[PDB]
Amino acid sequence: SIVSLLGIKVLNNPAKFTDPYEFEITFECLESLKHDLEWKLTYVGSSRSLDHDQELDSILVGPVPVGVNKFVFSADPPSAELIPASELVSVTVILLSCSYDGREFVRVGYYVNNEYDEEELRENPPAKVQVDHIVRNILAEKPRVTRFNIVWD
Amino acid sequence: DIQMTQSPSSLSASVGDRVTITCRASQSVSSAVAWYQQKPGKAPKLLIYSASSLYSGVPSRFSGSRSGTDFTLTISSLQPEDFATYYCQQSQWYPITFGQGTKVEIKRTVAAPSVFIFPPSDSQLKSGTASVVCLLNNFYPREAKVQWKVDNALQSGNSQESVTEQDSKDSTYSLSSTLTLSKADYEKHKVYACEVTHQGLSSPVTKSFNR
Amino acid sequence: EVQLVESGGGLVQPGGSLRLSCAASGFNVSYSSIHWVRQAPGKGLEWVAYIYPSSGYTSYADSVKGRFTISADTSKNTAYLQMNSLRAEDTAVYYCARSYSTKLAMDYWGQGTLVTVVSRRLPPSVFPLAPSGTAALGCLVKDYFPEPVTVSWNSGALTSGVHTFPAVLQSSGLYSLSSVVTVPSSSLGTQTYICNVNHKPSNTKVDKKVEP
Missing domain, CATH: 2.60.40.10 (Immunoglobulins)
Structure with missing residues (x-):
């Protein structure tokens, strides 16, 4: 494995639902590589239909710097218009993954709590969801890390 | 040790000129580049962020572009209030780094x-x-x-x-x-x-x- | 309406400490990141540190890490920069700035506070540059520390044609500058020309008459 993820900091947390996601990513690259890394943030909604995922954003790194490297990935927020109203205040998942030359080799998942700003809203949620009052809390202390063996160069 | 190499150090222009300022990142940056204006005795003001996004309230004659590791600020038609110093910034790689600045001066x-x-x-x-x-x-x-x-x-x-x-x-x-x-x-x-x-x-x- | 109000600057001994504060209003600092960026006299911008008050995560520039600590009190909507073991090269205007939804670009900046790291205060030596139909004359303001000095002419009454030059650091490590003015040569011998040189760090003022 030529690249390994060493660490993720979930920087702006808790955040508003519509705030971008700012993660500091630390990775190590052991040797020169021919192709790009692609880091990707995927929203995994609580909707039951198969389209419940959103690729939120992605960032390419290339040519890959050798050694230990630290950078910030700023990912666009979810498209609320693509999320059923009943699923905006809900427990959901975000996945940060990385691929090399299109081949995924690491994925980090987090559960995400989503609740209203104020008590009166939490106890009497309106039928029309007020997305501007929803606060997300990425449960950053409990990442689920999965690695996949891939061919590099 | 990422560098933002800003050129030129200064340039002279007239009102109405098209002005371009370039900042070259020493390694690839996807989009987190910004441009600032600073006038003597004043704090900087944000113009462009995310390489090409116009910050709210900034005049449309300001624009930003990315060409590989070249990041460019363009003023399509210089106005009198645009004579100032301009800085680029990258904020993808640790550490946040500014370019050395470009002073836009008045031709005479x-x-x-x-x-x-x-x-x-x-x-x-x-x-x-x-x-x-x-x-x-x-x-x-x-x-x-x-x-x-x-x-x-x-x-x-x-x-x-x-x-x-x-x-x-x-x-x-x-x-x-x-x-x-x-x-x-x-x-x-x-x-x-x-x-x-x-x-x-x-x-x-x-x-x-x-x- | 967004304010970033800094405080805490001033003169400090090398090896000493200062705490800077940044009181924010008009936005919740919890959802932003708060940065410090400094500007040495006559130089460009240098990023110093940031904090995300929501998470407490921070980052430091290499030259200040371990010496400076950034922190935030969300209940007071305020951030702090504790600066220890200060060095000559930390002299600068320190700006507080906010980043929000801009990929760590800073969209709001405070007005800055000046930190001057100095042990010895040395008031300038003021020498006349005597005039030799337009004539030039001036004052040489030599061997002072630290910056700044201010120069005026005839107590502020003479402003036209005045050029006060930026200070240069001499090989001795002391600053020097000149202030010059061009005047009608026919005014010499009747009209008095005095340069007023103030050095607040040593609490010294000098008035020097400049005669042919």
């Missing part, structure tokens, strides 16, 4: 300096040191060559220059060159001269005094 017609030379004052000599000052007053453009000669011997390493910012009224510069010698060395020589070469001078101008 060539103006030759008026040149003046000042011997060490009697009171400085009485205090034990000697400073000779050459003044280039109200000239344009900024580029100028000032050379010191002592008894016709060219000097090196014992002079420092300072230059004003562009004047508000006539858009000229003024420049000082200060020659520092020991008092003993000053009293040993007779002829002190500064020679000025400038675009607005048909031939170099010398101002001189004998001690």
Whole structure:
């Protein structure tokens, strides 16, 4: 494995639902590589239909710097218009993954709590969801890390 | 150790000109580049973020682009309030890094300096040191060559220059060159001269005094 | 309406400490990041540190890490920069700035506070540059520390034609500058020309008459 993820900091947390996601990513690259890394943030909604995922954003790194490297990935927020109203205040998942030359080799998942700003809203949620009052809390202390063996160069 | 190499260090332009400023990242950056304007005595103001996004309230004549590791700020038609210093910034890689800045200055017609030379004052000599000052007053453009000669011997390493910012009224510069010698060395020589070469001078101008 | 109000600057001994504060209003600092960016005299911008008050995560520039600590009190909507073991090269205007939804660009900046790291205060030596039909004359303001000095002419009454040059650091480590003015040569001998030189760090003022 030529690249390994060493660490993720979930920087702006808790955040508003519509705030971008700012993660500091630390990775190590052991040797020169021919192709790009692609880091990707995927929203995994609580909707039951198969389209419940959103690729939120992605960032390419290339040519890959050798050694230990630290950078910030700023990912666009979810498209609320693509999320059923009943699923905006809900427990959901975000996945940060990385691929090399299109081949995924690491994925980090987090559960995400989503609740209203104020008590009166939490106890009497309106039928029309007020997305501007929803606060997300990425449960950053409990990442689920999965690695996949891939061919590099 | 990421670098944002900003060019040029300065440029002169007129109202109505298209102005471009380039900042080259030493390694690839996807989108987290920003451009700032700063005026003397003021804090910076954000213009462009995410390489090409116009910050709210910023005039549309400002735009940003990414060409590989080249990041460019374009002012499509310079207005009078746009004369200022501009900085690029990257914020993808640790650490956040700014470019060295580009000063956008006002173009005007060539103006030759008026040149003046000042011997060490009697009171400085009485205090034990000697400073000779050459003044280039109200000239344009900024580029100028000032050379010191002592008894016709060219000097090196014992002079420092300072230059004003562009004047508000006539858009000229003024420049000082200060020659520092020991008092003993000053009293040993007779002829002190500064020679000025400038675009607005048909031939170099010398101002001189004998001690 | 967004304010970033800094405080805490001033003169400090090398090896000493200062705490800067940044009081924010008009936005919740919890959802932004708060940065410090400094600007040495006559130089460009240098990023110093940031904090995300929501998470407490921070980052430091290499030259200040371990010496500076950034922190935030979300209940007071305020951030702090504790600066220890200060060095000459830490002298600068320190700006507080906010980043929000801009990929760590800073969209709001405070007005800055000046930190001057100095042990010895040395008031300038002021020498006249005597006039030799336009004449030039001036004052040489030599061998002072730290910056700044201010120069005026005839107590502020003479402003036209004045050029006060930026200071230069001499090889001795002390600053020097000149202030010059051009005047009608016919005014010499009747009209008095005095340069007023103030050096607040040493609490010294000098008035120097400049005569032909």
